[PDB]
């Protein structure tokens, strides 16, 4: 049976790394509603005009989406204006960051891990294949008005932004609480990260070798850990399917003698063709409207993700959020962002307690008619003596008048025990 | 008239409980577009195929929603992997939790309060009535392709999750800052919750009886307080209305001689029936598309709520958020989650100051040419003497050299007063 | 080259003000689907009924949006129940708030800045022009079923709410951590805002004149700084465009002999008119459905913004969020909300470090075989002597036994230096 004076306190700990993947953006596309609905046909074009402004409005809606996609990327990545140069030391206290930092030997300045992500995530190809030089109208005709737009920010630009966000200000002064995760005086920076989670400084300095070894090992595990990227792979598959719908639907003779305008204008009287053409226009218009509606709703989902990604970057990467399970499970220490196809990947570094054991505890200690409360932390018994220590790491200290405060009375507190508080001044007087 | 040296400090306080209700999920449904649009008719089916892939795509969209609904529930509740057993003490320091914990005597292991919520919130019935054994195709035909899907997680499973989230780790070691709201050494756990809002430990230990009495009373009020659940009742009513739309619309002869396929095929020539059938297909398709669009938009709303509910659970239940009015109005102490039909209910426990009175204050005290600033809290005057105390509870202490720090000069600070700081060492030297 | 013992510490600072603009709400509108689709025509009305409940459902959807718009406003502004009176001092320690507080001499009780916003942001007019007395049906007919609804809360009411939120509780007791940004004992309130960002109290009291001067200057800059409000101007333009779509589309003879019902009923046989009318109904219905869909999606965007605005108000205005870049860039001190057309404007006051210089640092100091760690802050070298100071403002203090704690050993910490720790008791013993 469990009693009401038993506290579990960790005697050891480990450092772990978890991965979060967010779908910041999606491929920018545009559909020319006039070319999609009507091909090389004057009769179709004139009939389409008689249906009013539906076509024009749809172009507007899709354009707005394409613009938002660049806004999303900028809000997430364009937060730092640093250039980012090259660190001439390559040693941050035994810590290995060579796998998260840009590799100078590569064509594209990506880190090893970023490259793993890049080569993992796989209509758009066909459009890309018809182009290469700068003929967009030619391809648009081949693809029935469906075109693909370039991003505002290229892969190289994003890599530069993440290099600035991750490290940036390596050289020219450490900023303990006002800058990127990676800076030269790393051992100290960490000391003020442990403190931020209720772990005193000595814990880091006395265990630098163990901690660095655990950290370096954790990174290696991430490379093998990386399924995994299905969350971003889904982005491409979902968008490709939507485009496939538009293309296939053009072959549907929606109550029509055919799906080909030329086979309606030919071998058919004027008013007969007008009716058949109108039927195809009505169906193709309905199809396009369905597509656009789906894109508007989907785009909203990606916008929400982009906002979250930007928020987490500010609070997890360029800060130390204390929100539970917000920057990963456990006690947040830091985050190292990485670029990825259509999204951002965060490597969250957290502190995890280990090897807990229950010790006997008490509310307060009665010294001489007065109740002494712990200034910080808890009181624990090792079976023969009472000590005062912290909650996130077991390290008993002698209970003295400088570790407690006095309030109320011995006869008021219920869980009061009889122990002795040490007065450090008496030996100095004598 | 008010002066510029008047600070209001609470001399008393109360503990209050507020209720938050969130619509985490909605009933999972599915519509067979082929059966809905076309019944037992070959002619209708063939004509529907001529309209392309519209029907297929709509099935896809609705299926995606049904899946998301289980994801939403899992993100909110499936955060803890504890089993949750039975506490053999039933006494947490005079605190009564019998009304929030599962009742062993019930068929369904719900708490008393959970049961109140369960029996408060009230097409779906009719479908449920035709089934009972496992005949789904038979009902689907009766209900024109409209069917209802079961949840991944049953009510019993949710009750178990909330039991783990609320308490879970009652026996086998208290985890002061790394576990559920309810653990055996409750009086102490609370001490470190009061501290978390700037209220020193003695406040709790000297007032355990009053605090427990207020807490127990507050819970009783909640039972009578529980309108109230309209927020979740709306979920059922909104969804039922949407389904009613689809059913009723089938009776609309949208520019047709009838709304019954059999009355079109009968007493009508082949090409005449084809036209009339196409008109009904076009209308029924438009109706179904309207329905699906509404479900996609609505589903997005519920997804946002589920994400918020999950976030609050992590930060309010399995932590102590300091975000203002995030976990309820006042100073957050803890939260006790409860299950509910189509949602989650949070009972937020907050600290509320009472019986404030304004005292005269000052920036700093001049002792001997040097300005002494409060180490923590404020300086106050009782009319004849100056004392130092905290801000969230009035408890005057003697101003000593250990309660202040020295900076600047007496002649620099504007709101400087002439008082005396007590030096605790002199009596020891003499 | 940079070394691994260099810390940049600010020797000066400035106070800055940034502006955030949020689109809380949008104009409430309603469309009478029956009047829009069918004008003064019995034949059109009867044919519309034959299409079922589409028309009715659309009215429902738009109504729901109009209601949500008032909910959005209430959640953001209706958080405080104070009356707000008049401060008879007009002096908060040299700080000038006359430009953010309501001006008693104006017809509408707005602040100067609020008035700048009001007169900056510019179908709806035409409807507003036909009315003035309370004839809504007359205008509705003139505008083809398109009407405009009044807000629940008028401009005056909002101004009163923001006056309560900004100041409210000026007279009758200061509430250091439980009330609005503006209260009489401002110099002290600020002291506990600087402390909240790791800046000790003396920093404010010794620099009141400089700080007040910077603050007052910053406000003047905002007036000239106020493009700018494009974010809210877009709200009107986007909504106006959507309404223009509905109006223009009524002129489209969507496969019809005309767009005028009277020109179809006249000079045409009964069954011929029925067909032509049905074509117009189908197009006008499709147009209305398109409009409503766009409004539902757009409304969701504004709902998200309203929720964010309300959240920030609680955490930024009625609190001191520590979330990075959440309440503005830099260290958050306070926020002063202002009303605006269709939205809310926040003036964020932040602390920004200035004039940094790198000092030489070290992990710990070895005194006599034992390692002394800083109780708070960092150790720095001025080139000849070691001092201990804080991180957000350079102010060296003598390193004493009361500024450090002892842990581990001299021979364990790597970055250990040989310095002397001062013992303050020896001079008292002698
Ligand atoms: C805390 O846990 C770590 C990891 O288990 C312990 O480090 C291991 O110590 C053993 C014995 O010296 C070595 O053989 C292993 O190689 C170490 N592992 C690693 C990754 O270095 C550490 O000793 C434990 N600390 C305490 C106080 O028990
Ligand atoms: C940091 O990690 C990198 C990558 O794991 C290490 O580089 C590898 O070192 C081994 C051993 O010499 C070689 O066999 C591999 O071929 C190297 N890989 C690459 C990509 O160069 C690097 O040595 C580690 N540095 C430290 C200080 O631990
Ligand atoms: C609780 O801690 C105390 C202090 O470390 C332990 O007492 C010491 O035990 C060591 C090892 O036998 C002796 O060399 C010291 O002289 C003892 N000091 C004192 C003041 O007695 C004590 O044994 C521990 N209790 C338990 C159950 O482990
Ligand atoms: C803690 O110390 C107090 C004070 O010495 C103890 O209380 C006394 O106990 C004796 C023996 O039962 C009584 O005769 C005295 O009258 C008590 N004095 C008071 C003021 O109560 C107390 O029992 C000790 N507690 C423990 C656990 O040792
Ligand atoms: C703080 O407020 C509480 C609640 O009003 C006070 O508790 C009451 O005290 C009176 C007088 O002893 C009793 O008759 C009531 O029954 C108590 N109420 C409850 C719920 O127990 C408490 O005394 C006040 N504290 C102070 C210092 O004034
Ligand atoms: C905790 O609350 C429960 C429910 O209010 C209390 O149980 C009730 O006790 C009264 C008085 O004996 C009975 O008349 C009711 O019939 C009981 N209700 C139920 C559901 O059992 C319980 O006694 C309270 N326990 C404590 C320690 O306060
Ligand atoms: C301010 O507090 C002081 C200290 O409690 C009060 O002075 C004491 O008053 C009591 C009751 O008359 C006396 O028994 C003590 O001897 C007094 N102590 C001292 C040092 O004078 C003082 O009266 C309070 N002032 C007001 C206005 O309430
Ligand atoms: C606080 O103490 C200071 C120092 O004793 C007082 O300042 C002196 O006041 C006398 C009388 O007006 C003057 O003659 C001295 O020249 C002043 N000395 C200085 C350095 O200013 C001060 O007035 C006292 N304040 C209060 C409120 O008692
Ligand atoms: C911190 O920066 C402020 C602003 O630059 C300095 O204030 C200026 O000081 C000069 C010299 O006395 C005056 O001529 C300017 O008019 C002041 N500016 C303002 C706005 O008042 C301040 O002196 C600097 N502090 C330190 C220690 O260097
Ligand atoms: C606070 O700011 C207001 C507005 O800038 C100041 O009022 C202006 O004062 C100047 C100088 O006397 C006049 O020329 C302007 O016409 C005034 N404007 C208005 C709207 O009244 C006010 O004096 C400032 N107060 C303080 C203490 O700085
Ligand atoms: C580091 O700070 C110390 C203490 O202020 C400086 O030493 C003082 O310098 C002043 C000006 O020359 C002398 O009047 C004091 O007597 C010195 N005090 C001591 C203990 O030497 C020291 O010069 C500063 N070092 C540097 C490089 O600026
Ligand atoms: C800090 O003080 C220690 C202790 O005096 C110094 O260590 C000694 O240095 C001398 C000279 O090299 C050696 O002969 C002793 O054997 C060392 N003693 C120990 C325990 O190591 C240390 O060198 C000093 N460091 C600095 C930077 O002054
Ligand atoms: C609860 O604590 C009291 C006081 O120490 C003790 O007497 C009682 O046995 C404890 N309960 C259990 C089940 O151990
Ligand atoms: C608590 O004590 C029990 C009994 O010794 C033990 O089985 C359990 O593992 C302890 N809890 C922790 C966290 O060590
Ligand atoms: C503001 O404080 C000063 C200094 O104590 C005082 O002289 C003045 O009367 C106070 N103002 C009011 C209205 O009381
Ligand atoms: C502040 O003082 C006035 C005057 O005595 C009083 O009416 C008011 O209630 C006091 N404020 C508080 C919070 O007690
Ligand atoms: C890093 O710190 C060590 C120890 O003080 C020093 O010897 C080394 O030169 C420093 N590295 C650089 C590049 O200054
Ligand atoms: C760091 O030192 C270098 C070299 O003197 C200097 O150029 C740089 O400005 C310093 N960093 C800061 C923040 O002052």
Residue numbers in the entry:
A (entry chain C), B (entry chain A), C (entry chain B): 706 to 827, 833 to 844, 847 to 938, 943 to 1146
Which sentences from the paper describe this structure?
This metastability, however, constitutes a challenge for producing the S2 subunit (fusion machinery) in the prefusion state in the absence of the S1 subunit. Here, we set out to design a prefusion-stabilized SARS-CoV-2 S2 subunit vaccine enabling robust elicitation of antibodies targeting conserved fusion machinery antigenic sites to limit the impact of viral evolution on immune responses. Furthermore, we previously designed a fusion machinery (S2 subunit) antigen stabilized through the introduction of 4 out of 6 HexaPro mutations (A892P, A899P, A942P and V987P), the VFLIP inter-protomer disulfide (Y707C-T883C), an intra-protomer disulfide (F970C-G999C) and a C-terminus foldon trimerization domain.
Both constructs were recombinantly produced to characterize their expression, stability, and structural properties. The E-60 construct harbors all 9 additional mutations we selected to add to the E-31 scaffold.
